[PDB]
Design a protein around this motif. Structure first.
Motif, PDB file in Angstrom:
ATOM      1  N   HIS A   7       0.870  -1.174   0.000  1.00 51.03           N
ATOM      2  CA  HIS A   7       0.000   0.000   0.000  1.00 51.03           C
ATOM      3  C   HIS A   7       0.904   1.220   0.000  1.00 51.03           C
ATOM      4  O   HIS A   7       1.811   1.322   0.818  1.00 51.03           O
ATOM      5  N   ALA A   8       0.656   2.140  -0.926  1.00 49.86           N
ATOM      6  CA  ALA A   8       1.463   3.346  -1.040  1.00 49.86           C
ATOM      7  C   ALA A   8       1.570   4.112   0.273  1.00 49.86           C
ATOM      8  O   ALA A   8       2.599   4.726   0.561  1.00 49.86           O
ATOM      9  N   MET A   9       0.515   4.067   1.077  1.00 51.01           N
ATOM     10  CA  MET A   9       0.512   4.789   2.347  1.00 51.01           C
ATOM     11  C   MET A   9       1.001   3.989   3.552  1.00 51.01           C
ATOM     12  O   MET A   9       0.964   4.485   4.675  1.00 51.01           O
ATOM     13  N   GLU A  10       1.465   2.761   3.333  1.00 50.70           N
ATOM     14  CA  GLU A  10       1.938   1.945   4.448  1.00 50.70           C
ATOM     15  C   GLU A  10       3.099   2.631   5.163  1.00 50.70           C
ATOM     16  O   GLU A  10       3.904   3.324   4.544  1.00 50.70           O
ATOM     17  N   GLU A  11       3.172   2.431   6.474  1.00 52.23           N
ATOM     18  CA  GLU A  11       4.224   3.030   7.289  1.00 52.23           C
ATOM     19  C   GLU A  11       4.874   1.953   8.146  1.00 52.23           C
ATOM     20  O   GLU A  11       4.223   1.348   9.001  1.00 52.23           O
ATOM     21  N   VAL A  12       6.153   1.689   7.904  1.00 49.64           N
ATOM     22  CA  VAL A  12       6.852   0.694   8.696  1.00 49.64           C
ATOM     23  C   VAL A  12       8.182   1.262   9.146  1.00 49.64           C
ATOM     24  O   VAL A  12       8.596   2.340   8.709  1.00 49.64           O
ATOM     25  N   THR A  13       8.842   0.533  10.031  1.00 50.61           N
ATOM     26  CA  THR A  13      10.152   0.928  10.516  1.00 50.61           C
ATOM     27  C   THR A  13      11.114  -0.223  10.252  1.00 50.61           C
ATOM     28  O   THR A  13      10.841  -1.363  10.626  1.00 50.61           O
ATOM     29  N   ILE A  14      12.219   0.071   9.579  1.00 57.66           N
ATOM     30  CA  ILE A  14      13.238  -0.937   9.311  1.00 57.66           C
ATOM     31  C   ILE A  14      14.391  -0.603  10.256  1.00 57.66           C
ATOM     32  O   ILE A  14      14.864   0.531  10.278  1.00 57.66           O
ATOM     33  N   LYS A  15      14.829  -1.579  11.045  1.00 59.56           N
ATOM     34  CA  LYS A  15      15.928  -1.350  11.982  1.00 59.56           C
ATOM     35  C   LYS A  15      17.205  -1.932  11.412  1.00 59.56           C
ATOM     36  O   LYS A  15      17.254  -3.117  11.091  1.00 59.56           O
ATOM     37  N   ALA A  16      18.236  -1.100  11.289  1.00 57.70           N
ATOM     38  CA  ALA A  16      19.527  -1.559  10.787  1.00 57.70           C
ATOM     39  C   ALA A  16      20.512  -1.625  11.952  1.00 57.70           C
ATOM     40  O   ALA A  16      20.860  -0.593  12.532  1.00 57.70           O
ATOM     41  N   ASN A  17      20.941  -2.835  12.299  1.00 57.27           N
ATOM     42  CA  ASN A  17      21.908  -3.025  13.377  1.00 57.27           C
ATOM     43  C   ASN A  17      23.268  -3.153  12.715  1.00 57.27           C
ATOM     44  O   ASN A  17      23.547  -4.141  12.034  1.00 57.27           O
ATOM     45  N   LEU A  18      24.112  -2.151  12.917  1.00 53.57           N
ATOM     46  CA  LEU A  18      25.434  -2.140  12.310  1.00 53.57           C
ATOM     47  C   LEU A  18      26.538  -2.604  13.252  1.00 53.57           C
ATOM     48  O   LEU A  18      26.543  -2.264  14.444  1.00 53.57           O
ATOM     49  N   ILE A  19      27.457  -3.399  12.711  1.00 56.77           N
ATOM     50  CA  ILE A  19      28.614  -3.870  13.461  1.00 56.77           C
ATOM     51  C   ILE A  19      29.828  -3.526  12.607  1.00 56.77           C
ATOM     52  O   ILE A  19      29.894  -3.902  11.428  1.00 56.77           O
ATOM     53  N   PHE A  20      30.786  -2.809  13.189  1.00 53.84           N
ATOM     54  CA  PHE A  20      31.975  -2.414  12.449  1.00 53.84           C
ATOM     55  C   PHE A  20      33.152  -3.353  12.704  1.00 53.84           C
ATOM     56  O   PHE A  20      33.100  -4.193  13.596  1.00 53.84           O
ATOM     57  N   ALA A  21      34.209  -3.203  11.911  1.00 57.92           N
ATOM     58  CA  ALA A  21      35.382  -4.066  12.018  1.00 57.92           C
ATOM     59  C   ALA A  21      36.002  -4.147  13.411  1.00 57.92           C
ATOM     60  O   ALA A  21      36.490  -5.210  13.809  1.00 57.92           O
ATOM     61  N   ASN A  22      35.993  -3.043  14.158  1.00 58.44           N
ATOM     62  CA  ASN A  22      36.577  -3.064  15.495  1.00 58.44           C
ATOM     63  C   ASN A  22      35.597  -3.496  16.580  1.00 58.44           C
ATOM     64  O   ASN A  22      35.901  -3.413  17.766  1.00 58.44           O
TER      65      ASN A  22
END
Ligand code: ZN
Ligand code: ZN
Ligand code: ZN
Ligand code: ZN
Ligand code: ZN
Ligand code: ZN
Length: 72
Positions: A7-22
């Motif tokens: 649906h064009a009006m759909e509203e969601v949240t995408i969570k990006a969990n980032l892990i770096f080299a260190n």
């Protein structure tokens, strides 16, 4: 699978969990349609590649969570 009624009006949240080299980490959230929020999340990962290296993703939570790791 990953069955989705769009649906064009759909509203969601995408969570990006980032892990770096260190081992450092951070989480960033993206909101909008499932498709657009997902695109924005990957766009953010791409902006971080110059300083943090190439990234790898493992999708979770039916697509609402993107676990991204940077190689350095
Ligand atoms: Zn699949
Ligand atoms: Zn519908
Ligand atoms: Zn259905
Ligand atoms: Zn959609
Ligand atoms: Zn749309
Ligand atoms: Zn730099």
């Amino acid at each position: 699978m990953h069955h989705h009624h769009h649906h064009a009006m759909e509203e969601v949240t995408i969570k990006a969990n980032l892990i770096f080299a260190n081992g450092s980490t951070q989480t960033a959230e993206f909101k909008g349609t499932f498709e657009k929020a997902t695109s924005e999340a990957y766009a953010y990962a791409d902006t971080l590649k110059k300083d943090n290296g190439e990234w790898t993703v493992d999708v979770a939570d039916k697509g609402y969570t993107l676990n991204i790791k940077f190689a350095g």
